[PDB]
Structure 1
Amino acid sequence: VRLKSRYILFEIIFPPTDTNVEESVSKADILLSHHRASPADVSIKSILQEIRRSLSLNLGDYGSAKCNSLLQLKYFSNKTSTGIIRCHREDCDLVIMALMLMSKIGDVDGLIVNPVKVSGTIKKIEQFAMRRNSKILNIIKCSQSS
C-alpha cells in the first residue's frame, strides 16, 4: 500500500456582475467574459491561506485536521487561474465541498470556484487539462473566424 492521493483541478471564474451595461449572447464571447483574468495579489500562499481559513470557518477543526494532513497546492499559475490540490482519497469529498464554499478572497470579492477534474494521478489531469484548453481554443477560433 502506497500513498494513494488524489489531485483536484480547480479554476477561478469571475461572473460579469454589471447590471447597468448590456451583455452579448454567444458561446466563446461568454467564455471570454468569464475567463477574463486573475487579479494582482494572487499566489500559491494566498490561495492556501484563504482555503485554510475557509476550511476552519466552514468545516471546523477536526475536519480541518483530517483535511490538512496532505493538503498542498502542487501547481498554480495566475496567468490562467488553474490550480491542482493534492489530497487524500477519503477526504476528497471534504476538499471538493471546501472548494465549493469558497466565497471571496480577502482582497477581491465577486468570484466562483469551479472544480473540474479529479483523478488519483497528476499526469492524466494535465493531459485532460491540455485537451480541455484545446477545446477552448477551438471554440475561440470558431467564433473568431466567424
Structure 2
Amino acid sequence: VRLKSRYILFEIIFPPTDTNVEESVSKADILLSHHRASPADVSIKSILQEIRRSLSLNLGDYGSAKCNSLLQLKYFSNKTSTGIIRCHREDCDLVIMALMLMSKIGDVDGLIVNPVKVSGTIKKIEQFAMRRNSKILNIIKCSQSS
C-alpha cells in the first residue's frame, strides 16, 4: 500500500524590466538575464507563507482546504531558485493555477513563476532537472566558447 501524490517543479524567473537600459539579443545572454539570482529573504517558510496567502486570497477557503491537505515544499534552495511542491493528483490543477497567479513576494516584487515539470515521483523530476540544467550548461558553454 502507498500514496499516489504528485510533485511539481517550479522556478522563479525575474523579468528584466529596465526601460532606460538597453538589451542584448541572444539565447544564453537572456538566460543569464532571467536566471540572475534569488534575493536575500527567500526560504522555505517564506515561500510557503506567500503561497498560502495567495491560495487564500485567490482560491478561497474550501479550495484552500482541499489544497492544504498535502501542501508542502519538499526541496528548495535559494542558490538556484528551483523548488518542488508536493500535492495530490486531483488538486494538481489547483496547485498549478495557484502557482500561475503568484504576483509578488512581500519583500521583492517584479517576478514570475514558471511551473516546469509535474510527475508522480520526485526521483524522475530530479533526473529531468539535472538534464535540463545540463542543457542550460550546454547553451551557456556554446555562447561562451563563441
Classify the TM-score, shorter chain: over 0.9
Q: Deviations over 1:60-82 (max 9, x none)?
A: 00000000000000000000000
CA distance in 1, matches of 2:44, 2:110: 19
CA distance in 1, matches of 2:11, 2:73: 13
CA distance in 1, matches of 2:33, 2:63: 36
CA distance in 2, matches of 1:77, 1:142: 27
Determine what percentage of the aligned residue pairs are the same residue.
Answer: 100
Cα drift, residue 91 of structure 1? 0.1
CA distance in 1, matches of 2:76, 2:113: 14
- 1:19 alignment partner, SS class: coil
The two structures have a TM-score, normalised by structure 2, of 0.99
Structure 1 residue aligned with 2:57: 57
Structure 1 residue aligned with 2:143: 143
Structure 2 residue aligned with 1:24: 24
Cα drift, residue 2 of structure 1? 2.5
Cα drift, residue 33 of structure 1? 0.1
CA distance in 2, matches of 1:2, 1:68: 20
- 1:55 alignment partner, SS class: helix
Query: Tell me, which stretches of 5 or more residues in structure 1 are unaligned?
Result: none
Q: Deviations over 1:90-123 (max 9, x none)?
A: 0000000000000000000000000000000000
The alignment yields a C-alpha RMSD, in angstroms, of: 0.5
CA distance in 2, matches of 1:121, 1:43: 23
The two structures have a TM-score, normalised by structure 1, of 0.99
Cα drift, residue 142 of structure 1? 0.1
Structure 2 residue aligned with 1:102: 102
- 1:138 alignment partner, SS class: helix
Cα drift, residue 46 of structure 1? 0.0
In the comparison of the two structures, how many residue pairs are matched? 146
CA distance in 1, matches of 2:94, 2:54: 12
Q: Deviations over 1:5-44 (max 9, x none)?
A: 0000000000000000100000000000000000000000
CA distance in 1, matches of 2:140, 2:85: 28
CA distance in 1, matches of 2:27, 2:77: 25
CA distance in 2, matches of 1:131, 1:13: 19
- 1:136 alignment partner, SS class: helix
